[PDB]
Design a protein around this ligand. Sequence first.
Ligand SMILES: Nc1ccn([C@@H]2O[C@H](COP(=O)(O)OP(=O)(O)O)[C@@H](O)[C@H]2O)c(=O)n1
Ligand SMILES: Nc1ccn([C@@H]2O[C@H](COP(=O)(O)OP(=O)(O)O)[C@@H](O)[C@H]2O)c(=O)n1
Ligand SMILES: Nc1ccn([C@@H]2O[C@H](COP(=O)(O)OP(=O)(O)O)[C@@H](O)[C@H]2O)c(=O)n1
Ligand SMILES: C=C(C)CCOP(=O)(O)OP(=O)(O)O
Ligand SMILES: [Zn+2]
Ligand SMILES: [Zn+2]
Ligand SMILES: [Zn+2]
Lengths: 153, 155, 153
Amino acid sequence: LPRVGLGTDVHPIEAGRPCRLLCLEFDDADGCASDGDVAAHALCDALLSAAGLGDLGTIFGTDRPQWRGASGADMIRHVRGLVENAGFVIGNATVQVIGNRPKVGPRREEAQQVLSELVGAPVSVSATTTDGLGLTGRGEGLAAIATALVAAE
Amino acid sequence: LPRVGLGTDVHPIEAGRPCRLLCLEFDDADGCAGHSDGDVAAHALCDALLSAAGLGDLGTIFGTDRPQWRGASGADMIRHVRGLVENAGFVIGNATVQVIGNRPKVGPRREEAQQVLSELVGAPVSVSATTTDGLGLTGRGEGLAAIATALVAAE
Amino acid sequence: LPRVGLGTDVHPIEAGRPCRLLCLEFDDADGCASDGDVAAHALCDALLSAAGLGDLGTIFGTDRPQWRGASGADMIRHVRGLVENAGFVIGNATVQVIGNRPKVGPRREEAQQVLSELVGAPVSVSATTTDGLGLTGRGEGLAAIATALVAAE
Ligand SMILES: Nc1ccn([C@@H]2O[C@H](COP(=O)(O)OP(=O)(O)O)[C@@H](O)[C@H]2O)c(=O)n1
Ligand SMILES: Nc1ccn([C@@H]2O[C@H](COP(=O)(O)OP(=O)(O)O)[C@@H](O)[C@H]2O)c(=O)n1
Ligand SMILES: Nc1ccn([C@@H]2O[C@H](COP(=O)(O)OP(=O)(O)O)[C@@H](O)[C@H]2O)c(=O)n1
Ligand SMILES: C=C(C)CCOP(=O)(O)OP(=O)(O)O
Ligand SMILES: [Zn+2]
Ligand SMILES: [Zn+2]
Ligand SMILES: [Zn+2]
């Protein structure tokens, strides 16, 4: 049987930080307190759970010198290698961004292309607001939830 | 290899609005805000199917406040998304949705909800519900949330 | 085709209450207000939804005498049985804990062992914080979210 995984991530928006999201950089928005890319983090966690390999802390720890400066793209590439070396093929992954700004839509196809090449399987990208409700609706943070489907050789 | 997708949606409760939820009409309840009928479970399901199939999200398909989709039922939206999914070459295997909120109570109409949604999706749809125990974005009867998954396969 | 399901759950944290989480005891932190095992509940809901069998309310009712005070392990044991009886084989399941305390990392592999034995299939365990934001970030509550994959026969 194929195996399913899921990951979520939430970070505060940091005013004046460059907006790194979905392995893109967005003009006219602020990023999150790596580069704070909530979508990349959720995707790593979905892939790692699908394959039984733990989560971000398990594999990256905190302030390890070998991960200094590394982006969401660097993390995804590394997670992809771990999943493949554990004997899995990646079927697909999806990620939904939850928050107000930036608007993901105008660059949604570009994100899908960037992320599908990082993962080596089709990655679906979507977005929603919460219509003013909760930490995301208040513009306090950005959230993402991701799924992945892998299968053992 | 089959493909999995996920969708979530959140709306505030709007006083006096008819409660359209899970493609059912719940009397004795409001009533989510939106350009649509505010069916949070239908929107989440549409998102889950569109994402499993790599076809975008609601904004991709229905746009913003388009005259053609005003007051559009969740049923309209699901039937439209089912056709897009099948035209793109996929068979829908199953889908699931969990409603997160205090009112209405889904339990009494859960089996009916699954019946309606399975007909519209063309595959078995699981329905569940949870409250928040008085906590968070929807812990007050402030709003309703839904989270949905879907599984599709070529060809 | 195999079938996917998802489950979420949120409980308030209560001072003094024993922390039963992921079918372990963290004799350590608070402490949710059955035994408040948010992760066991989410997992049950994911399995039931994949199999098309309802949710916790469907199956344990409300204040049913025979399930009054059923632990998380009791619940998953029964859910596993319902799923197999409906003619399904469980492929895998995953659960992410969302909250500040306890720290799941040091006992993550133990939780995976315990839960995999109870489900009869590989259970992935992970954890995240919300970096100070929302009900879990303020320490008012603990949440979990879980997926499951099952197949007929
Ligand atoms: N950060 C965001 C939020 C929404 N959107 C888009 O805007 C449309 C409307 O979003 P919404 O705020 O109604 O989200 P929901 O609460 O209806 O699910 C979505 O379907 C997406 O296409 C986006 O591109 N980026
Ligand atoms: N809007 C809602 C919310 C919950 N429920 C029911 O409440 C049951 C348990 O959710 P809850 O939050 O009320 O109770 P626990 O999650 O604390 O066990 C669910 O399995 C549903 O059967 C419902 O029917 N309609
Ligand atoms: N209650 C918790 C929360 C997080 N953790 C661990 O803390 C690490 C850091 O989580 P985080 O605060 O960066 O959460 P994210 O929003 O980045 O996903 C996680 O990868 C887990 O290994 C834990 O062990 N127990
Ligand atoms: C959509 C997500 C990620 C949850 C936000 O809700 P909150 O947990 O912030 O709810 P509040 O108590 O802050 O209103
Ligand atoms: Zn993160
Ligand atoms: Zn909506
Ligand atoms: Zn519970």
